[PDB]
Design a protein around this ligand. Structure first.
Ligand code: BEF
Ligand code: BEF
Ligand SMILES: [Mg+2]
Ligand SMILES: [Mg+2]
Lengths: 132, 133
């Protein structure tokens, strides 16, 4: 069973993502948060296998949270509206294992969690497609 | 069984919303769309009880779509990031039954669908605390 923490400031989306992932037999949402701090606190304390991280959240962004969790051993997958090369470069330098867009098909999220748990790096193809 | 069409351009969110609503025993997601036209086409043709409508979508907005569906008898609930007075007033003039924010708790969605089916007008308390001032 893969343990997942979800950090997403928009409650409707946070609740819907937890519901989308609890559909999976080999996955479990162990906690939900709305800020970068909620992610840092849970991940350092509860140590879930995976953290689904939104970027733009109040207080501390998901990129800032990812930097604070760089040496924790948790596999961070960024899930954001923003296809920004600066956000992506800061995310990869922080050691994130994935970077997905909120415009990626929903099925790609559970797939990315399994891939990342298998040591793979998952970046939405839509990113390169947006830039070029 | 309440039939619902969801129009949301962000696929991840569209898929997650359908999953959130298919959890309910008295509800059913009969279609999903990413544009305002997808909403107009499905609603006029398939006539679901309810349409969960995002505002900002490519091609045709959810408000432009809500206006085209004003006389269809489908109960439209707006679900958006935007607590914008102009969007709200255009939505209500189009005859939308609800206006929810993406910052409303996830439970507000299934509750609003049942309330709207019971002839009520549902506006997110978060929207009213911001705008009603
Ligand atoms: F607000 Be998250 F970066 F989509
Ligand atoms: F893009 Be929708 F108006 F949140
Ligand atoms: Mg956010
Ligand atoms: Mg949109």
């Amino acid at each position: 069973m893969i343990s997942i923490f979800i950090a997403e400031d928009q409650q409707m989306l946070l609740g819907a993502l937890g519901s989308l992932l609890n559909l999976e037999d080999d996955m479990e949402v162990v906690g939900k948060g709305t800020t970068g701090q909620d992610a840092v606190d849970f991940v350092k304390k509860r140590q879930p296998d995976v953290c689904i991280m939104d970027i733009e959240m109040p207080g501390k962004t998901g990129l800032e949270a990812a930097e604070e969790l760089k040496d924790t051993g948790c596999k961070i997958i960024i899930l954001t509206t923003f296809a920004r090369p600066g956000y992506f470069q800061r995310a990869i330098k922080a050691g994130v294992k994935g970077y997905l867009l909120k415009d990626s098909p929903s099925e790609e999220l559970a797939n990315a969690i399994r891939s990342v748990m298998n040591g793979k790096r998952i970046y939405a193809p839509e990113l390169m497609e947006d830039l070029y």
